[PDB]
């Protein structure tokens, strides 16, 4: 229903999220993974004002532009990601509630039949493995 801003400082108890959070430095305000995905795919036409195969379609074959420009879609993606990183899963069923990230990770562990003491004793190792996989 709403849009959630990213937290001012990116510290989450050893976890690293630079590769997926929005990057203010770039003009497009897109995460590096999003930028790589954008660059990899080669698109032909996007409905922009036209004036060589695309030029040969002056026979009533036109391409309308999508309603949502692919700049505000990034805003939705950022909103969902910020909500799921700063509020667990409670923002999908009511008013969002804050909660520290390690507690959320411990409860997700407890979901699959592993007691949270495992996380609270191997936090640093888990964070390093997550960072390496994301890298």
């Amino acid at each position: 229903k709403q849009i959630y801003k990213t937290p001012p400082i990116k510290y989450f108890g050893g976890f690293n999220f630079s590769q997926i959070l929005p990057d203010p430095s770039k003009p497009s305000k897109r995460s590096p993974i999003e930028d790589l995905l954008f660059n990899k795919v080669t698109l032909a036409d996007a409905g922009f004002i036209k004036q060589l195969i695309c030029a040969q379609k002056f026979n009533g074959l036109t391409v309308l532009p999508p309603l949502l420009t692919d700049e505000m879609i990034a805003q939705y993606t950022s909103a969902l990601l910020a909500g799921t990183i700063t509020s667990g899963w409670t923002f999908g069923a009511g008013p969002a509630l804050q909660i520290p990230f390690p507690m959320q990770m411990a409860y997700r562990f407890n979901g699959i039949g592993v007691t949270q003491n495992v996380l609270y004793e191997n936090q640093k190792l888990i964070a390093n493995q997550f960072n390496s996989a994301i890298g």
Binding site: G47, P65, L67, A96, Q98, P100, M103
Partner: protein, 87 residues
Amino acid sequence: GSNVFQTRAGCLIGAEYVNNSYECDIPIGAGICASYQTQSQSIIAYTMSLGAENSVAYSNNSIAIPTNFTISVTTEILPVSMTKTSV
């Protein structure tokens, strides 16, 4: 000659741009919508608003817990069949 605005999907004749933001009724395209609104009588075009702005207060040792609840009743509608016909 008057009230001519150029968009990313062709220019629009008969409307005036507005710098506010509203949930939009008639989708024009490329993130531009239009609607009938007062100033008293005119058709305006503007950029859509994605939603109401909000923020959270994430912190190292802060949690939020509710103290009350509410039972709600929504609704859902689904077609199951169409009319039978023969020729």
